[PDB]
Structure formats: C-alpha cells, structure tokens
Amino acid sequence: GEAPNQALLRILKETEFKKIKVLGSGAFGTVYKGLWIPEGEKVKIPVAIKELSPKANKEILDEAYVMASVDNPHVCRLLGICLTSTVQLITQLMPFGCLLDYVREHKDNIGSQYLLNWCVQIAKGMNYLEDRRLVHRDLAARNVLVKTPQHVKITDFGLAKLLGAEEKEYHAEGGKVPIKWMALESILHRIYTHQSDVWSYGVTVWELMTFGSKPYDGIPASEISSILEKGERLPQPPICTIDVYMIMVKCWMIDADSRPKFRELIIEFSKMARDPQRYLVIQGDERMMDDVVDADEYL
Ligand SMILES: Cc1cc2cc(n1)-c1cnn(C)c1OCCC[C@@H](C)CN1/C(=N/C2=O)Nc2ccc(CN3CCN(C)CC3)cc21
Ligand SMILES: [Cl-]
Secondary structure, three states: OOOOOOOOOOEOOHHHEEEEEEEEEOOOOEEEEEEEOOOOOOOEEEEEEEEOOHHHHHHHHHHHHHHHOOOOOOEOOEEEEEEOOOEEEEEEOOOOOEHHHHHHHOHHHOOHHHHHHHHHHHHHHHHHHHHOOEEOOOOOHHHEEEEEOOEEEEOOOOOOEEOOOOOOOEEOOOOOOOHHHOOHHHHHHOEEOHHHHHHHHHHHHHHHHOOOOOOOOOOOHHHHHHHHHOOOOOOOOOOEOHHHHHHHHHOOOOOHHHOOOHHHHHHHHHHHHOOHHHOEOOOOHHHOOOOEOOHHHOO
C-alpha cells in the first residue's frame, strides 16, 4: 500500500546543548532558545527546545515522528530529540516568533508584498504536507513561524494525522479542538481532510489580512457551527480587494470539493504577488558569533 518511512530520528546528547532562555510557555508547554553544538563539528546551530508523565512522552513522540518525516523549506524540520526525564523536541530556532504576534506588532510596517508572499509560502508548505498525505488539523497564524520577515514555515504538528492506505478522511474522537479555524464538517462530524485544512488556510489568511484580528471575536465557540450553517462567514478585511476576499470565501464553501486546492492557492496568490498593490490596498504601502550556522544549512 504505502511506502516505507525511512526518515532518520536523531538522538541528541544533553551535553551537546546550551539552553539560553525561555521563549514561551503555555498550553503546549515550554519552548526554549538554545545553541546546539554537534559532536566536534566546529558549528553552532540556534535551536528551539520544546517540552510538553507517560501521556506527555507519548504525544511528543508522535509529534517527533511527524516532524522527522517532513523536509520542505516552508515546514519546520525536526533536528532531533533529547531523551531526558521529559522528552525534549529540538527544532530550528525561528527568531521572529509566531506570525500572529508578528503582524499585530508590525502592523504599520507590513506591506502587501509581504502579506501575499506569506500566503504563497504557507500554501506551498500545506501543499507539501498534502503530498506527504499529512492533514495538519491546526493551521492558524499562531502556528506559522517567522524565520525572517521574508521566510515563514508551518509548525506545531501536535494534531497532525497521517492519512494511510487509501483513506481520504481522518475520523477523530473527542479532544479540545480550535473551533473557529475548522471546517463545518469537522465541527459537525469530526471529519478532517486536506480540504478541511484549506478552510483553516482561509481563516489564517483572514488573520493576516486583518493584522491579527480574532475570528468571530466575541462569539463563543458553540454558536460557530450554527452561524456557519446560516451561511455567515468572516467579513471582508478593509485592505482586501474582492479578488483576495473571493479566494477566502472559496476556502469556506460547504462543499469541501468546491474549495480551492493548495496548489491552486499557490498559483493565485503568486499571480497577485507579482502586482501586490493591485490586490491589497494599504496606507503607505510604498514606503514600508563566528561558527554559527542556520539549521537550514546544516544538512
Ligand atoms: C521549529 C519551531 C520553532 C519555534 C517553535 C516551534 N517550532 C513550536 C512547535 N510547536 N509549538 C507550540 C511551538 O512553539 C510556538 C509557540 C511559542 C513561540 C512563538 C515562541 N518563540 C519561538 N519559537 C520557536 O522558535 N521563537 C521566538 C522568538 C522570539 C520570541 C519573543 N516573542 C516574539 C513575539 N512577541 C510576542 C515578542 C516576544 C518568541 C519565540
Ligand atoms: Cl476556538
């Protein structure tokens, strides 16, 4: 049926690391900044170190499995794991943080060119996950990280599921789920596909085009299903021409097969990125150590 996953899982010694400071803490757990210094290789690699009990070790290992199986410039790659008391996920340090916080903080300095390139890059990442038969199930602006303002990558595979065999849906059970980003069929029937990731892509783009507004702000999660059933959608962001908003609305069709595919999202946003100010109208757009090696260059 499917192909052998010959990915390599790299077990990193704790002595090869230097935790430097806490970057973030919350529901996921704790993320740290640090430096990885492999073996006697004269190299220092900036890394993010993530900790989430046997349940915690199981779930972080499921995440390590997925991240070790992806290799794409717009997906965060696993560097390895450290087998301490609690299992640590070691990944590439993304120095500018999550894109949600980035657009909120740099609102008045984000031009149409960046907004549309980010849409292209996120869609490339998602189309790659689709190539690997991976449904993310948690695409959102908080889960896109900023390597540089010109280069973003999808992260957080804690909900990601590998469609096997010839299966097309992933039928989930209970568990906390981000209601305001999920397709209507996911809310109602807990069915997840690449096309339900497309819906979340549309909410993510809306997050970017509003400079980090909260979807359905004020509405609790339990009415989302009924609001969506009435035909109500997120509103048109002020900077968005009808060309861009129409793309988002198509991501929110009831019929999942009517939504655009990620490879078509790449094409459309890529055409719009060639003439950004024809598609987004933003005020003032036109005026907007020695041995360190980035993980993307340590192969
Ligand atoms: C490959 C990779 C890299 C990284 C994380 C993950 N994966 C990952 C995977 N699953 N999950 C849940 C993950 O964590 C995401 C949640 C926290 C994150 C924003 C922290 N964070 C960070 N994360 C990673 O590098 N880099 C950061 C650089 C700077 C700052 C300072 N703030 C910036 C914005 N404002 C608020 C000022 C303060 C915070 C940073
Ligand atoms: Cl939510």
